[PDB]
């Protein structure tokens, strides 16, 4: 019914200011029945709801991060904001924004969340940004296995699609680990016909956008 | 305030089998009790809201009862898709707060991983790095055992693996284990070998390959 969608920064250093917007399409910031509000997600704290701005412009906050937050809405732009102020590596998480939709009228109990954005990961960290170096991993001489080794980036995350998103079965893209260096890597991998090493061209698009690194690797056999 | 506890944590289960996931609020909120459903990667989705109202789009396998402060979640018959986290969520009193989450995972039948294994590529050797891949593809089930061998000298500390999240297909796993080396290190040796073992397997598989050589 709604389509929400974060952007802001994925780094940011600690004692700074997080700030995050929320654009909406497919209705209006403004309502009767429904309002925003933000929830963050962590390994260990799992999910964590933040705070809410209601129609009547009254807002509600997390006791535990009170004193830091501010959210605030533009029905101009039909956006709304989080702000979160002198922030730490406890406050790395996945921040969601979401519609709250009342289900009895002008009552705050009862409340569901209706829709979330995909999620905007941001990493509290003093360490620089750095993109990614792109290495095939070559098909060996009825099916075969080619890939990429996407290397030593941050913050989270990177995105990789193969041959500009038309080629989808068949591929793994594994989970980023993190590496003592501080650096994160991960592998993406596609099985395909041995037949058609030579005929098809295999190219994995890596995208990270917190270091504006867009890299095209061809993988070939060797 | 209110905090809310959910039972199994994990439990795995066969196709087409029920579910049951139990909810319990330190105090009673009415029915004021919501689900939702996370995929891996995606946000998490709206099942049922207020105790039992099924969502707009949400299979009728799923359903919702209680009130007080025990409450279930049902799903009659499990499905891949449904390969997911659960949670519910209390919205009695602000602030709103979610259970820890129940893990849902698909028990299928036993599926050998097909193992490969790559070389460091040229350009990365060249900027002084050497990373060896090995590959375990779509298997079942998640226990599996990778060792490196290097010129038959079982290695140590220097490689870490991932897996991915079960396939919401065919409700397998992948896993890459990465061995790492400087380029000084790497061409000291020739065979550099990955060996799996998994209950899929009668004896372990191992993959290899001679440094410079095609």
């Known amino acids: 019914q709604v389509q929400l969608q974060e952007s802001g920064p994925g780094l940011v250093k600690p004692s700074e200011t997080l700030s995050l917007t929320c654009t909406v399409s497919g209705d209006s910031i403004s309502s009767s029945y429904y309002y925003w509000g933000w929830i963050r997600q962590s390994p260990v704290k799992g999910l964590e709801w933040i705070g809410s701005?209601?129609?009547?412009?009254?807002?509600n906050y997390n006791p535990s991060l009170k004193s830091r937050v501010t959210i605030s809405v533009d029905t101009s732009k039909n956006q709304f904001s989080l702000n979160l102020r002198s922030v730490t590596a406890a406050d790395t998480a996945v921040y969601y924004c979401?519609?709250?939709?009342?289900?009895?009228?002008?009552?705050?109990?009862?409340?569901?969340?209706?829709?979330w954005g995909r999620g905007a990961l941001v990493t509290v960290s003093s360490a620089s940004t750095k993109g990614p170096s792109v290495f095939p991993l070559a098909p060996s001489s009825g099916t075969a296995a080619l890939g990429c080794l996407v290397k030593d980036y941050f913050p989270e995350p990177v995105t990789v699609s193969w041959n500009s998103g038309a080629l989808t079965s068949g591929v793994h893209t594994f989970p980023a680990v993190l590496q003592s260096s501080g650096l994160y890597s991960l592998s993406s991998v596609v099985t395909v016909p041995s037949s058609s090493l030579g005929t098809q061209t295999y190219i994995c698009n890596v995208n990270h956008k917190p270091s504006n690194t867009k890299v095209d690797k061809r993988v070939e056999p060797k | 305030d209110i905090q809310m506890t959910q039972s199994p944590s994990s439990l795995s289960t066969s196709v087409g089998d029920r579910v049951t996931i139990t909810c319990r609020a330190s105090?009673?909120?009415?029915?004021?009790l919501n689900w939702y459903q996370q995929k891996p990667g995606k946000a998490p989705e709206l099942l049922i809201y207020?105790?039992?109202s099924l969502q707009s789009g949400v299979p009728s396998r799923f359903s919702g009862t209680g009130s007080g402060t025990e409450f279930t979640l049902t799903i009659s018959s499990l499905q891949p898709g449904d390969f997911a986290t659960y949670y519910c969520?209390?919205?009695?009193?602000?602030?709103?707060?979610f259970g820890q989450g129940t893990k849902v995972e698909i028990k299928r039948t036993v599926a050998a991983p097909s193992v490969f294994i790559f070389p460091p590529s040229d350009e990365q050797l060249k900027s002084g790095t050497a990373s060896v891949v090995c590959l375990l593809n779509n298997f079942y089930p998640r226990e599996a055992k990778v060792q490196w061998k290097v010129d038959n000298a079982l290695q140590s500390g220097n490689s870490q693996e991932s897996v991915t999240e079960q396939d919401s297909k065919d409700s397998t796993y992948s896993l890459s284990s990465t061995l790492t080396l400087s380029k000084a290190d790497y061409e000291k040796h020739k065979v550099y070998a990955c060996e799996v073992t998994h209950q899929g397997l009668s004896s372990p598989v191992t993959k290899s390959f001679n440094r410079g050589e095609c």
């Open positions: 979401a519609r709250h939709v009342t289900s009895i009228s002008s009552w705050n109990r009862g409340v569901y969340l209706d829709s």
């Open positions: 969520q209390q919205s009695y009193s602000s602030p709103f707060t």
């Open positions: 105090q009673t909120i009415s029915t004021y």
């Open positions: 207020v105790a039992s």
């Open positions: 701005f209601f129609y009547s412009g009254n807002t």
